[PDB]
Design a protein around this ligand. Structure first.
Ligand SMILES: OC(O)[C@H]1NC[C@H](O)[C@@H]1O
Ligand SMILES: OC(O)[C@H]1NC[C@H](O)[C@@H]1O
Ligand SMILES: [Mg+2]
Ligand SMILES: [Mg+2]
Ligand SMILES: [Mg+2]
Ligand SMILES: [Mg+2]
Ligand code: NA
Ligand code: NA
Ligand code: NA
Ligand code: NA
Lengths: 1016, 206, 204
């Protein structure tokens, strides 16, 4: 009882030693439930031998493990609270969460951690029946503890564990007692395992996954491997099951393995224990391999996730069942052949996304309802694969990916991004034991899951010799799955797939040791033969995903470009509450954590409550499984489905004339995997009116599926048809000139131009003013996250667009009135102006305008702008003003319902759209320029109408307030409505968010620009 | 050669195919390479001896090839031609006669070179077992080594007898083997396989 | 001084655990002598910074590590003999050497070894100058110990090692003192490292 004490157990300091990653922990294995009935195992009913210890626990926080009193090992602390488990303790306010990207949250001095190490003392009092203690084995299973822990059971020390993302199991058979038992668990926030856990995410701690008790017989199944081999046409498979047993070998022991396709038993095999001769000493007495033949098996894929049920029975020769286990089996073959990743003989096209386990309320505690909501949203947006960035997930995630159909990259919990250099640990043999436990225990847990098709060695840890060793371990133990790893340049000997992060389509990025070549160039470098799948691309931080269509054009054209995984799925924001209890989304330094990396945790396609960002519909369009070509009257549909026929798809088509519908119809799709269907439209309506005819098609699923509602739209496309230019041609407004203003009147309408500023300063409809701010040129935007270009908060890039714009005085440029005149035409008043924008005597821009007010009360505005070639190209070229009116609806003829930019508008459609005014603002958590719609020919708001060919955004927030506000909950609506009408608007970039990423064709570099707008 | 031999296990790779023994095994390989990599006389690394073929062998082979590409790695276990070795290095493969065991056949050295796919050199890690009055047929190996270019020799078993000195009742020393110290069970005179006696006096086979 | 005791150090039983092959052992490296003169290094003369501790040591044999009394950590046992180091203790008649080819000399039950585990308690009293302690680092280097051992320096526990054929080195800078120092080394015949050491040879 001296050796069970805290002074003894703590003094060796196992959390500051990479050579001790566990003590008395059991071997890793696939998920067990220990069914004592074969029918409960087959139907996956809940075993009575697996007890969840989740629920109310006692919890006490301590600033260091030395501060834990010795009485906690025997009795509950009076100062302890009662908390729910699983949970992170930072979500209950005991200390703060820390957001840091690359820089470690502790002092870099491995293997040591600080003396101030926050310690969470968990305890649970609970009952075990005597029947669990009279026979068999009782183990406790912690599915995830962050980041290291010692365990006591009834005041006796049991063991120690360190990987936060894999289960730790301990035998409690010698420690339990009939009646009352008490577990005490001491969780440390930091350890030497923390040096391998430097992912770009919130750093939390605690018992954040499930805790369970499992009872097994003394003679028990200890492991089982399922594999499926095929012939060349996939018409016959062999399910090879390898079972291992612990306990005492008797000759009456048998293992039966049955395969079930639903209720039909499809194959079965029985055998005594005894593997085949392995070497000179013989073979495994405690193992048996059962080979089950399967004729014409239904194949598993993400398109059709066909699953079987394998039941493994350990029984006696007289048919007495000892123990049953089971798993869902998916028949599929993953293989790289001739430079191509093949699934069931067909080359994949990976429509993937990276997904952290994140909940804005529960932190890193994952529940089945959140996982199911994520999977449906992903599949509804045409994703077919997920990368577990950057750790083994909750075990239910793989079961859900098996059932719904998503390919999965399973990734070991190793990231050492903060080291200098990045491979300082991974090239060191003294850390090879630690790293090997994080790879080998992941493969042992997850190797039976069909949805897992690729292993990953971790993320952003350079390239060391330990990576090459662990790659060869996985290839030896599990040849059925390729291994990939990005570190050290993404094409090392530790990966089977070239898997770069943020390699661009056409532009090379020649860094010194780790160049990011263009994806197209990288395939043809001499010697290179591997497929290329980006492990991260299209960094979706805020208003992003510009240039996303360029990737998908390249993926379809190049056979060895097999897709990639978008960064990333969900924003990593946390909910805080204001003084009146209103929740608001928080990021980086919002919890007092310093240093931190601010809004860089929020890179998602969806908000933290799983509401979609506008970029997600661009991804759904570019990733869609039907492609269309129009010839004249004939549509050519091509399926990108590799395995399924289009048996739940109906093609709707419509023709409209400037929003006005003219004809439409439906045709059922009937296209094979990778085939084509020709669809002949009827003789189209030839309208007499002027305007552009548009053809829109949409593929609709009439029947619901497991992941989609009835009527789900899965793909669409729009084309221009014939165009009829208008050759139809359409009292006298009075010009009253004073010294300060030009005032024009026409009936109840009046326009006033200020002669000192040169801008339209006011309009009247009757006695009602319409403008609160004048109508003035605008050359700037409230900067996006891609404009700001910061991944680490300590590093500012002078080549970023916001630094160049600020240093060039774009945000402070003052206009000088060069000319302002007025004249009376035969039927109109013409106002001519010219302004020059200057910063310290440098003329940035010149703007020449003419305002032409006719007799019908229309104001035709013509704008010609000159941009200095040595200033950085402006973010926009347009006009802005604050209208006095606040209206409920915005109606307009242009591209798409959602926010779209010139770099990201392929998913939007030309049509007449009508939305509430709050729908015209995208509430990004870090505020910025948002809500733009491009390609617009007409805009209606209140009594006003604008016509031309422009991009607009309209909101209650000025660009100045957007730039000056760090959080969206601090925004307040201004007095009127801010309108930004842009002749031209820069792209938004998004190849990455820490360097300039707008392509040169999306920049405003033409030097001279022209646009025209008609108000009324 | 790393200090790894698990000959007594059943099967021989029960530990070396187990990931829970991969840390132990890795320390025995990596600390040998770190100590000895500057020595010019060391031209080949070995992963140990008579431990079957496990996944840990393939991992530690790839570690050595990454850290020190200047030396080939060999390993005999699991049939002497696995993916854990750069050299076909069998023990007691005969010149012309095959020995077809089940999982680990000892082909004839000449036949082993021409099996389909095989391209590696062949150097016997043990051959010509010199137990007592032995080394019959030694000239047959050396005729084969000179004739076949990919037969690049081998290592005789072995140099010195492993006998220990005991003393009689009058203090006369005598050479002892196996169960001469009360150790039981033991394997008798099988420790004495040398070309020389334990006092380094040569046997006639030398 | 409770945690330096035999009852504390032994009770975790590091020799029956393949996940603990060392504790507080330094990184492996090529052979060092730390010459403070470039000409002595080039001509391979013997460095004054490398001291051989070979010679006469005190030795006591025990049938198991539990049988070691607690007073051995602080003072020499009166029953101890004086033996030369390096040496195998079976060549001094303390127990017998074992010749076995393939069959392990212990019960095959990894990672466990028998409770009857023959233990060799070595100790050495020796002097260090103050100049070694005033600055720099002092390490002890065991070039080979069969098959596993715990180490104490002046009654404080220093570490643990397991590979019998490679050097184990430990930093002794916090443990040494000017004048008289005493190392105590407890060598175990069998451990979980013995499962990887089944060569056809005498087991000593
Ligand atoms: O590998 C990923 O975790 C990192 N790459 C960029 C992304 O923002 C994240 O920090
Ligand atoms: O590998 C060697 O150690 C073994 N092969 C045969 C020889 O007698 C010895 O037992
Ligand atoms: Mg540790
Ligand atoms: Mg990182
Ligand atoms: Mg050990
Ligand atoms: Mg042997
Ligand atoms: Na492709
Ligand atoms: Na990030
Ligand atoms: Na030759
Ligand atoms: Na022998």
């Amino acid at each position: 009882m001296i050796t069970d004490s805290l002074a003894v157990v703590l003094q060796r300091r196992d959390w500051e030693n990479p050579g001790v990653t566990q003590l008395n922990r059991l071997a890793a294995h696939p998920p067990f439930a220990s069914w004592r009935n074969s029918e409960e195992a087959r139907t996956d009913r809940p075993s009575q031998q697996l007890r969840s210890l989740n629920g109310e626990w006692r919890f006490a926080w301590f600033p260091a493990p030395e501060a834990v009193p010795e009485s906690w090992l025997e009795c509950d602390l009076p100062e302890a609270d009662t908390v729910v488990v699983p949970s992170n303790w930072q979500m209950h306010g005991y200390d703060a969460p820390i957001y840091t990207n690359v820089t470690y949250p502790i002092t870099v001095n491995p293997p040591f951690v600080p003396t101030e190490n926050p310690t969470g003392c968990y305890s649970l009092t609970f009952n075990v029946d005597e029947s669990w203690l009279q026979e068999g084995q009782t183990r406790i299973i912690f599915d995830g503890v962050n980041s290291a822990f010692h365990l006591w059971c009834n005041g006796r020390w049991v063991g120690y564990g360190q990987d936060s993302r894999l289960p730790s199991e301990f035998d409690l058979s010698a420690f339990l007692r009939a009646g009352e038992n008490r577990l005490a668990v001491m969780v440390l926030r930091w350890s030497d395992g923390s040096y391998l856990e430097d992912q770009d995410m919130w750093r939390m701690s605690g018992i954040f996954r499930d805790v369970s008790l499992l009872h097994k017989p003394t003679t028990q199944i200890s492991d089982f491997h399922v594999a499926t081999r095929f012939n060349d046409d996939f018409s016959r498979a062999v399910l090879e099951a390898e079972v291992q047993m612990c306990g005492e070998l008797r000759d009456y022991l048998r293992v039966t393995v049955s395969l079930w396709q639903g209720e039909t038993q499809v194959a079965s095999g029985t055998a005594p224990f005894g593997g085949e001769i392995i070497d000179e000493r013989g073979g495994y007495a405690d193992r048996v391999t059962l080979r089950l033949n399967v004729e014409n098996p239904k194949l598993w894929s993400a398109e059709i996730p066909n699953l079987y049920r394998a039941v493994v029975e350990l029984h006696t020769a007289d048919g007495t069942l000892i123990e049953a286990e089971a798993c869902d089996v998916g028949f599929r073959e993953v293989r790289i052949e001739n430079g191509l990743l093949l699934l069931n003989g067909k080359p994949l096209l990976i429509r993937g996304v990276n997904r952290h386990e994140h909940h804005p309320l529960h932190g890193q505690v994952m529940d089945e309802q959140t996982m199911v909501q994520d999977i449906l949203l992903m599949k509804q947006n045409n994703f077919n694969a997920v990368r577990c960035s950057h750790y083994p997930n909750h075990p239910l995630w793989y079961t859900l990916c098996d059932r719904y159909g998503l390919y999965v990259v399973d990734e070991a919990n190793i990231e050492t991004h903060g080291m200098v250099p990045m491979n300082r640990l991974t090239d060191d043999p003294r850390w090879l034991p630690a790293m090997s436990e994080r790879v080998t225990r992941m493969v042992q847990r997850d190797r039976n899951h069909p949805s897992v098709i690729i292993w990953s060695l971790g993320n952003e840890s350079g390239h060391g010799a330990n990576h090459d060793a662990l790659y060869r371990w996985i290839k030896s133990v599990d040849p059925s799955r390729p291994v990939q790893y990005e570190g050290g340049g993404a094409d090392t000997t530790a990966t089977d797939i070239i898997c770069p992060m943020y390699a661009r389509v056409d532009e090379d990025q020649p860094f010194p040791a780790v160049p990011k070549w263009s994806i197209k160039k990288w395939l043809s470098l001499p010697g290179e033969t591997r497929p290329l799948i980006l492990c991260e691309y299209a960094h979706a931080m805020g208003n992003s995903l510009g240039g996303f269509a360029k990737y998908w054009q390249a993926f379809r054209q190049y056979p060895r470009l097999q897709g990639g995984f978008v960064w990333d799925w969900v924003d990593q924001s946390l909910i805080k509450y204001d003084e009146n209890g209103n929740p608001w989304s928080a990021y980086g330094g919002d919890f007092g954590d310093t240093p931190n990396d601010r809004q860089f945790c929020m890179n998602g396609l969806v908000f933290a409550d799983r509401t979609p960002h506008p970029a997600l519909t661009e991804a759904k369009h570019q990733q869609q499984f039907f492609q269309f070509r129009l010839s004249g009257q004939t549509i050519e549909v091509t399926s990108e489905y590799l395995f399924r026929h289009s048996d739940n798809e109906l093609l709707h088509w419509m023709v409209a004339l400037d929003g006005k519908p003219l004809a439409s119809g439906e045709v059922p799709l009937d296209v094979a995997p990778q085939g084509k269907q020709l669809i002949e439209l009827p003789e189209l309506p030839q309208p007499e009116s002027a305007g552009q005819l548009w053809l829109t098609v949409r593929v609709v699923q009439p029947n619901a599926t497991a992941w989609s509602e009835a009527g789900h739209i899965s793909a669409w496309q729009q084309w221009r048809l014939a165009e009829n230019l208008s050759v139809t041609l359409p009292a006298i407004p009075h010009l009253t000139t004073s010294e300060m203003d030009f005032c024009i009147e026409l009936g109840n309408k009046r326009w006033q131009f200020n002669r000192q500023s040169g801008f339209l300063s006011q309009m009247w409809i009757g006695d009602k003013k319409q403008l609160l701010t004048p109508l003035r040129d605008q050359f700037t935007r409230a900067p996006l996250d891609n404009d700001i270009g910061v991944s680490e908060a300590t590093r500012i890039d002078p080549n970023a667009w916001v630094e160049r714009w600020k240093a060039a005085g774009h945000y402070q440029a003052e206009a000088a009135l060069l000319q302002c005149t007025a004249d009376t035409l035969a039927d109109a008043v013409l106002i001519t102006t010219a302004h020059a924008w200057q910063h310290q005597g440098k003329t940035l821009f010149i703007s020449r305008k003419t305002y032409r007010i006719d007799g019908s009360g229309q104001m035709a505005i013509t704008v010609d702008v000159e941009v200095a070639s040595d200033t950085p190209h402006p973010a926009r070229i347009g006009l802005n003003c604050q209208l006095a009116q606040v209206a409920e609806r915005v109606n307009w003829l242009g591209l798409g319902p959602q926010e779209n930019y010139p770099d990201r508008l392929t998913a939007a459609c030309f049509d007449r759209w009508d939305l509430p005014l709050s729908d015209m603002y995208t509430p990004y958590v870090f505020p910025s320029e948002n809500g733009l719609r491009c390609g617009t020919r007409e805009l209606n708001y209140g009594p006003h109408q604008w016509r031309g060919d422009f991009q607009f955004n309209i909101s209650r927030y000025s660009q100045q307030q957007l730039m000056e506000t760090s959080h969206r909950h601090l925004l307040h609506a201004e007095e009127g409505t801010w309108l930004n009408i842009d002749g031209f608007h820069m792209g938004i970039g998004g190849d990455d968010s820490w360097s300039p990423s707008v392509s040169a064709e999306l920049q405003l570099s033409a030097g001279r620009y022209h646009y025209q707008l008609v108000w009324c």
